[PDB]
């Protein structure tokens, strides 16, 4: 039961009590995935418009 690092001030105080010692992708890659999904939408829409054209 040890209390360490007691810091007091006007608005309050903080401390620490111990009971026992122990025993990213780039912007180039993000734009590619964002434009790859927009391409799969245009392909699925073009195939729909082609199906409707038939």
């Amino acid at each position: 039961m040890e209390v360490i690092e007691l810091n007091k001030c006007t608005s309050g105080q903080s401390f620490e009590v111990i009971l026992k010692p122990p025993s990213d992708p780039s912007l180039e890659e993000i734009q590619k995935k964002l434009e790859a999904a927009e391409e799969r939408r245009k392909y699925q829409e073009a195939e729909l418009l082609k199906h409707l054209a038939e």
Binding site: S11, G12, Q13, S14, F15, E16, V17, I18, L19, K20, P21, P22, S23
Partner: peptide
């Protein structure tokens, strides 16, 4: 129960408001 690679303790913060 704490993990064996961490101390069994608490960090306390008191705000009087």
């Amino acid at each position: 129960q704490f993990v064996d690679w961490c101390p069994t303790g608490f960090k306390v913060g008191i705000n009087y408001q």
